[PDB]
């Protein structure tokens, strides 16, 4: 790897600098190098990894959606038959997105997840696994679309089981996991009722646990609860 000659601490420092500079491809390369040093990641380091790749894949997803919309318009009735270009370029972006997802899933499988024994780390990584299979599912067509979807579901389900046993209902990792699993149900798995049920149960069980929290933990939890509320409002 191109980062193999750089110190772990230096990679982490440079990832923080790249975040400040909004240089998220750099940030992801630095954190990939940090992961490949072979040591477990701290909480802060896990967050840096997540921020970097979420911003990278977020740009690709936004571009893929613009291009997919143009492509489907060009297949409507009454549309001038352009050439292969729109499809080609949507495929180019799609292939780069899949590469980023495969890279993240490779880091989790080699060997972040198997070395994660604390609930906060293991749930964080398993949620990540679900998320990046969900991004693959967004662009998947049917051949292995079913198996991609079941791979996302499996990872989210394992994370949910641990989080319910090991974390309180207000824990922000638990909340973000349930939020994203609910989006999976609604947008990927064609299960809007499961999405709505999960979002409402999650919200209500967190609400009943807020009284145990400090002002700072209260702010973190209610932030993600509001996203659950926002989706319920969109979905109902």
């Amino acid at each position: 790897g191109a980062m193999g000659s750089m110190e772990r601490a230096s990679l982490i420092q440079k990832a923080k600098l790249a975040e400040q500079a909004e240089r998220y491809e750099d940030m992801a390369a630095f954190m990939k190098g940090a992961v490949e040093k072979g040591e477990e990641l701290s909480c802060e380091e896990r967050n840096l990894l997540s921020v970097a790749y979420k911003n990278v894949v977020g740009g690709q997803r936004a571009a893929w959606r613009v291009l997919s919309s143009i492509e489907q318009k060009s297949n409507e009735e009454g549309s001038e038959e352009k050439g292969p270009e729109v499809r080609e370029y949507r495929e180019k972006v799609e292939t780069e997105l899949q590469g980023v997802c495969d890279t993240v899933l490779g880091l989790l499988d080699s060997h972040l997840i198997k070395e994660a024994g604390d609930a906060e780390s293991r749930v964080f990584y398993l949620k990540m696994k679900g998320d990046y299979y969900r991004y693959l599912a967004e662009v998947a067509t049917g051949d292995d679309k079913k198996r991609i979807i079941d791979s996302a579901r499996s990872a989210y389900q394992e994370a949910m089981d641990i989080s319910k046993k090991e974390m309180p209902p207000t824990n922000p990792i638990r909340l973000g996991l349930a939020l994203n699993f609910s989006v999976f149900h609604y947008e990927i798995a064609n299960s809007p009722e499961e999405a709505i049920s999960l979002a409402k149960t999650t919200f209500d069980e967190a609400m009943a646990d807020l009284h145990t929290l400090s002002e700072d933990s209260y702010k973190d939890s209610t932030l993600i609860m509001q996203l659950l509320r926002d989706n319920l409002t969109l979905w109902t």
């Binding site: 909480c43 967050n47 997540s50 921020v51 979420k54 911003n55 906060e120 964080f124 998320d131 824990n171 922000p172 990792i173 909340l175 973000g176 996991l177 939020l179 994203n180 609910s182 989006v183 609604y186 947008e187 973190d220 932030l223 993600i224 996203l227 926002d230 989706n231 969109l234 979905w235």
Partner: peptide, 10 residues
């Protein structure tokens, strides 16, 4: 259109 979780958590 659905909101998903921010990258950074607890």
């Amino acid at each position: 259109r659905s909101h998903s979780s921010p990258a950074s958590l607890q």
